[PDB]
Amino acid sequence: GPEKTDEYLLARFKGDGVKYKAKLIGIDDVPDARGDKMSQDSMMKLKGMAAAGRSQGQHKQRIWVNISLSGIKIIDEKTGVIEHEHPVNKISFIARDVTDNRAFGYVCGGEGQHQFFAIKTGQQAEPLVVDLKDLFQVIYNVKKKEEEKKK
């Protein structure tokens, strides 16, 4: 299909952007802004915790993951309340889960406050992961083109 352009991505993510059905596996404090191994260790811990909770009749919270030029919003599906919101410049790393095509996570937070948000997607995680890659790329592209033209 047609290759992406900056303008296509700007229109896709402006305003309310796009949203995906998911469940929140958990949130974990982590030591660094980025890293595959750090993220997977966090994913495994949070999945272990969710499995223990499941054995006690707990369920993961049903959410929308909203992706836009404003960053990522975690929205409670039942009530529609925004439970978590991180702007683009406070999201540091996107992690895939090699064990699970329906999970991914992201590291976010300012310095000394890095946290891993682990997400179980309703469908495959890859389209969401790619949307995040594209979101960050178009914002970076637009910034760089502005900088090159002013110099």
Added chain:
Amino acid sequence: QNGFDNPNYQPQE
């Protein structure tokens, strides 16, 4: 297969 950095990330608040 791996993850990726956000080049727009700014740690300081």
